Each structure stands twice: as structure tokens, then as C-alpha cells.
Amino acid sequence: VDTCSLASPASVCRTKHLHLRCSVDFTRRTLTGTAALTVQSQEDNLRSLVLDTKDLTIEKVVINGQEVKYALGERQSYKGSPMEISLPIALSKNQEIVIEISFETSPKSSALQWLTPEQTSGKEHPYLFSQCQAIHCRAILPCQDTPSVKLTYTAEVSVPKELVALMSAIRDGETPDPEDPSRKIYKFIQKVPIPCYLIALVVGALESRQIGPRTLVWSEKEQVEKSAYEFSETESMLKIAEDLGGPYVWGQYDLLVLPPSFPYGGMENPCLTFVTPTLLAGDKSLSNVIAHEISHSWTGNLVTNKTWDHFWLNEGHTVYLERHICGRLFGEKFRHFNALGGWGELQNSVKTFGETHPFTKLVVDLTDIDPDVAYSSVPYEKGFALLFYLEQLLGGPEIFLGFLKAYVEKFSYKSITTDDWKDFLYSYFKDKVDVLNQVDWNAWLYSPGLPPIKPNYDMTLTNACIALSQRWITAKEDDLNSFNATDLKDLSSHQLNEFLAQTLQRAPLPLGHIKRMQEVYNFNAINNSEIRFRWLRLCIQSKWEDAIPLALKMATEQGRMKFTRPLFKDLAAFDKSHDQAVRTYQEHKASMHPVTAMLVGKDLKV
Numbered sequence: 001v002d003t004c005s006l007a008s009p010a011s012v013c014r015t016k017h018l019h020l021r022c023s024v025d026f027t028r029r030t031l032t033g034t035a036a037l038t039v040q041s042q043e044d045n046l047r048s049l050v051l052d053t054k055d056l057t058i059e060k061v062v063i064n065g066q067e068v069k070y071a072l073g074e075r076q077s078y079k080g081s082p083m084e085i086s087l088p089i090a091l092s093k094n095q096e097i098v099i100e101i102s103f104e105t106s107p108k109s110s111a112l113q114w115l116t117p118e119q120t121s122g123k124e125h126p127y128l129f130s131q132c133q134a135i136h137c138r139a140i141l142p143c144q145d146t147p148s149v150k151l152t153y154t155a156e157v158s159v160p161k162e163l164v165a166l167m168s169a170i171r172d173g174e175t176p177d178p179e180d181p182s183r184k185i186y187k188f189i190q191k192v193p194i195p196c197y198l199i200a201l202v203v204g205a206l207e208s209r210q211i212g213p214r215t216l217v218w219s220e221k222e223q224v225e226k227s228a229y230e231f232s233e234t235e236s237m238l239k240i241a242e243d244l245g246g247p248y249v250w251g252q253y254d255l256l257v258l259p260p261s262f263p264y265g266g267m268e269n270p271c272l273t274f275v276t277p278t279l280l281a282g283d284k285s286l287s288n289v290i291a292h293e294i295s296h297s298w299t300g301n302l303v304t305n306k307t308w309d310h311f312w313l314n315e316g317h318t319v320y321l322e323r324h325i326c327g328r329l330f331g332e333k334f335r336h337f338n339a340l341g342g343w344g345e346l347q348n349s350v351k352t353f354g355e356t357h358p359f360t361k362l363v364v365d366l367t368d369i370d371p372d373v374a375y376s377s378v379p380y381e382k383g384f385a386l387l388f389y390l391e392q393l394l395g396g397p398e399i400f401l402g403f404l405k406a407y408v409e410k411f412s413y414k415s416i417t418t419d420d421w422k423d424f425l426y427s428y429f430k431d432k433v434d435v436l437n438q439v440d441w442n443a444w445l446y447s448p449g450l451p452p453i454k455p456n457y458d459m460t461l462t463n464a465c466i467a468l469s470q471r472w473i474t475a476k477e478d479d480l481n482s483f484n485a486t487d488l489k490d491l492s493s494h495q496l497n498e499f500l501a502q503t504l505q506r507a508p509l510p511l512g513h514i515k516r517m518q519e520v521y522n523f524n525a526i527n528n529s530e531i532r533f534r535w536l537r538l539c540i541q542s543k544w545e546d547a548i549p550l551a552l553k554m555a556t557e558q559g560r561m562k563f564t565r566p567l568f569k570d571l572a573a574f575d576k577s578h579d580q581a582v583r584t585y586q587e588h589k590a591s592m593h594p595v596t597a598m599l600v601g602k603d604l605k606v
């Protein structure tokens with residue numbers, strides 16, 4: 001059972017296909033149209049079924065050409081309202097019907113952000129994007145809003161003719177709208193069955209440039225050139241991923257670079273990954289996010305978590321593949337550097353949440369918990385740490401990647417739980433079950449806090465970062481003159497980042513040390529978003545008033561939650577910036593992404 005969904009479960013009926021016909025009304029901030037669901041009964045004598053909805057207006061529900069009865073239940077908070085449809089004829093097992101629902105979204109759909117022309121790059125046209133994961137697809141269309149059900153889809157989307165629509169699907173043509181010549185209809189086909197959280201739409205003034213044999217980058221005209229360069233490693237990463245995971249089955253791998261309020265680093269929408277413009281460092285140094293989204297084309301999109309309790313299956317295996325792609329590209333010592341940095345992020349989250357916090361468990365029971373509130377690094381890094389531990393336990397990366405390939409093969413086009421994964425792990429490693437029974441499964445999967453065993457990490461690339469951090473932490477005032485720009489000479493952008501991560505773990509430092517660091521290193525000049533983030537956090541936690549406007553500027557000029565949330569939190573904790581932080585949120589909140597708005601409000605207690 002999926003406790004985040006109000007709809008009939010997969011054991012009762014299963015959506016096979018969605019045909020979406022809709023129109024994007026920028027004037028009203030609504031999507032309007034029909035969702036035609038092809039539904040297969042899994043039961044004898046099926047006479048009704050229930051769908052997920054959230055802030056939808058239902059006009060009518062048509063089956064076999066006639067309107068039928070339906071009822072909306074009472075809102076159940078972040079789950080929305082259940083929609084019961086009365087079937088006109090009882091269905092036998094495996095019988096299929098088509099239910100055509102006429103609906104309209106609310107301007108406040110938590111799935112959607114509607115941007116004014118002023119919030120875009122070109123300043124002449126508005127822009128819309130969706131973010132359905134985890135349980136926001138129900139806020140666009142009525143559906144069984146659970147990743148335990150996979151469907152194919154087709155769509156026809158009418159938008160102002162000067163704008164472009166794209167979806168998580170193969171582009172299937174465009175024509176004028178016959179109902180309104182000021183409009184264009186874009187068509188789409190997704191032939192591969194997908195969980196509904198992978199349904200995605202963008203409408204905006206979009207241009208494209210080809211960057212590989214199966215990849216266009218899409219953005220507003222002013223970002224295209226920069227994006228083409230930033231993401232030029234994409235085809236080489238796809239090739240490596242195919243080697244590790246098996247055939248890429250989705251046809252195209254395009255990239256869409258969103259406006260700066262996009263709430264995450266990436267979203268693995270099939271055929272069209274969405275990314276944050278904060279990846280545009282100018283030097284490709286944040287391309288691990290592309291490797292991560294590419295990896296989801298196997299782990300997440302082919303093998304999918306059956307409910308959001310097992311989200312770690314999606315993320316852990318993805319981070320595991322991600323770090324492999326980057327290890328292939330840049331060396332095994334780099335894979336270990338990233339893995340070790342990941343362990344540090346995990347310490348930070350466990351430290352932040354508390355070592356007994358429920359959200360520090362690998363598997364989390366999400367009944368009554370809004371998944372957006374639970375979301376953190378834990379599933380990523382505690383999941384990664386388990387697989388890395390297991391890799392070492394069972395014989396190394398070549399051996400463990402054999403298992404990853406077999407696991408993707410085995411569960412392609414299915415939705416699985418943690419027990420399903422573990423079962424296959426024991427089946428694949430039947431000759432090593434003595435070694436598998438050494439792992440403390442209950443601790444790793446179900447206990448809060450740091451994992452019971454820390455893997456082994458090569459420290460080669462890390463040592464210089466630790467060394468410099470320690471010099472600063474142990475320095476007294478009479479040592480500050482010894483620091484010099486030449487300190488950073490042999491450090492990559494990745495190492496400069498890790499240096500700051502290490503130092504930030506011991507924050508606050510004395511204000512004079514921070515002032516000296518800006519004097520000698522000019523971190524204020526760095527536009528790499530990861531580096532700038534940690535630097536400004538270090539400044540604010542170390543009580544440097546000068547950094548206040550910089551931190552406020554970063555927190556609001558982009559909306560990647562990774563950055564925006566902890567910046568606002570830090571600025572709220574610093575008495576000098578507290579009032580401004582709260583006032584700034586209040587002023588920007590209406591024009592924020594709905595989920596980000598909600599979470600920053602909670603963080604600030606406003």
C-alpha cells in the first residue's frame with residue numbers, strides 16, 4: 001500500500017496510459033483540458049475507483065460517451081482530495097476502459113511555478129514549469145499518484161504561438177491550434193511506461209542547440225551558449241552510463257536549463273532532464289549533477305521505488321552510478337574523494353537532524369509525513385554509503401557493478417521495495433551469503449544516525465583540503481600573515497570546495513580569520529555556486545556583517561533549495577540579519593516556487 005496516495009491501489013486497478021489534451025492559460029495561470037486514463041481492472045466486479053487530486057476543478061467525467069457520477073472527498077492536507085468515480089458497468093479482471101476527465105488546475109498548484117516576463121531572462125514572455133516529484137502530479141491532473149503504477153502517455157498542449165512546449169517524452173509534431181490561431185499545439189509521446197511523477201511540462205520562450213548525437217540543450221536564448229559548453233561532457237557520460245547500466249532505452253537525452261527558481265539541482269524527467277542554472281560555473285566543474293541525472297535513466301526511471309518510503313533505492317543507486325561515471329572520467333582517486341565528501345554531508349545531516357531523528361533512517365515511514373518535509377541528503381548519502389560498504393565487502397567495484405547491471409535488468413519497468421532489492425542482492429551473491437550476513441541490516445536500513453560501519457576511503461585528494469582547513473582552524477592572529485594566495489595554487493575547484501566544507505564543519509571561526517581569508521583568497525570573486533554557498537555560510541555563521549547582503553542576494557536571486565534554505569536559516573540565526581531575512585522572505589514569498597516558499601516559511605518559523 002502507498003500511504004502517500006488516496007487513490008485505488010495497483011491491486012485494484014492500474015492505469016496503463018494517459019492521453020492528455022490541455023491548454024496553458026497564462027492569463028489565468030491555469031491548465032485546462034482532458035485527462036483520458038486507460039485503466040485496467042485487477043479485480044472482479046469492479047464498480048468504482050478512486051483517484052488522487054489536489055486543488056483541481058473537475059467539470060465532468062465521461063465514459064463510453066456518457067457523463068458518470070463522481071465525488072470529491074474532504075481535503076486531507078498535502079495529500080489533496082480523493083476522487084471517487086462510479087463506473088457505468090462493472091468490470092471483470094483485466095478489462096480495460098477509458099475515463100475522460102475534464103479538469104482545470106488552480107493558479108496555486110504545488111506542481112507548478114508560473115513566472116511573469118520580469119522573472120525570466122528575455123523579459124518579454126512568461127514561463128511555466130512543473131515539478132511533480134514526489135506527489136504533485138495530482139496537482140496537475142487526476143491520477144493514481146503513486147510510483148507503484150507505470151503508464152505510457154501521449155499529450156497535445158496548446159500554448160501561445162510565440163512560446164514553446166516541451167515534456168518528458170519524444171517530440172511528436174507541432175501545428176496551429178484550430179480552435180485559436182493565436183496558439184500552437186505541441187504533441188508528445190512517451191512509449192516507455194513511467195511512474196506519474198516523471199510527467200513534466202515546460203512552456204516558455206525556448207531555443208535549442210545540439211551538443212551530442214542524441215542531445216539538445218534547451219533554455220532561454222541568453223543561456224544557450226553558456227549551457228552548451230557547460231554540459232558538453234553529456235554524450236561521453238551517456239556512453240559510460242550505458243556501459244554500466246545497459247542500453248539507454250529512452251531515445252533522446254535532452255537537457256533543459258530552467259530559470260533560477262528551479263527548486264532542485266536536477267530532475268530526471270525522461271527524454272528531457274531539468275537542471276538548475278546554478279550549474280553554469282563556466283568550467284564544467286558541477287557536471288556530476290549531469291551524471292546523476294543521466295544515471296536515473298536506469299536507477300529511478302527503469303527500476304523505480306514502489307513507494308516513497310523506499311526513495312533511497314532511487315537515490316542511493318543513482319549516486320553510486322554517478323560517482324562511477326565521474327571516476328571513469330577523472331580517476332578512481334576522484335571517485336573516492338567524492339564518496340568521502342558524501343560521507344561528510346551525511347555527518348552534517350545527522351548532526352543537523354539529531355542522531356535519533358526518524359528522518360535519519362534509510363527507510364522512512366511516510367504515512368502522515370509530507371515527503372517534501374522529509375526530503376534531505378540522507379537517502380542519497382546513507383544509501384550511497386551502504387552500496388559503497390557492500391562494494392568493498394563483496395569484492396570491489398567491478399564485481400559490484402556486475403550486480404548493478406543485473407539488478408537494472410531484473411527490475412526494468414517495475415516498482416520495487418527495499419525487500420525486493422535485498423532479495424535480489426542475496427540471489428546474485430548466492431555464493432557470498434556468509435559475507436552478506438555480516439552486514440547489520442537492521443541498523444543500515446531501519447536505524448537513525450550515522451551508519452554502523454564507515455567504508456574505506458582513499459584520502460589522496462582530500463589530504464590537502466584537510467591540511468589547509470586545519471592551518472586556518474588552529475591559526476592565531478600572529479599566524480594570519482602567513483596565509484597567501486599561493487595556498488590555493490595546487491587545489492582544483494573541487495578541492496577548494498572541500499576545503500570550505502571542512503572549515504564550515506568547525507564554524508564559527510574568529511571574524512579576523514574570515515576577513516583575512518577574503519583578503520588573501522578573494523572568495524567573494526568566485527561565482528561557482530557550490531563554493532560561493534559554503535563561503536557565504538562560513539561568513540554568516542562567523543558573524544561577518546559585510547557578507548549579509550551577499551548571502552541575501554544569493555538566497556533570493558536563485559531558488560535551488562540546497563542553497564536557498566540553509567542561507568535563509570543562517571541569516572535568521574545571525575541576530576544582525578534576522579529581521580532582514582524574515583522581511584526578505586515575506587516580500588519574495590508570493591513570487592517563490594510554491595514548495596520552496598512553504599519550506600523556507602517553516603525553516604524561519606514564519
Ligand SMILES: Oc1ccc(CCc2cc(O)cc(O)c2)cc1
Binds near residue numbers: 376
Ligand atoms: O521531490 C521529492 C522527491 C522525493 C521525496 C521523498 C523524500 C524522502 C526522504 C527520506 O529521508 C526518506 C524517504 O523514504 C523519502 C520527497 C520530495
Ligand SMILES: [Yb+3]
Binds near residue numbers: 476478479
Ligand atoms: Yb603564535
Ligand SMILES: [Zn+2]
Binds near residue numbers: 292296314315318
Ligand atoms: Zn536523484
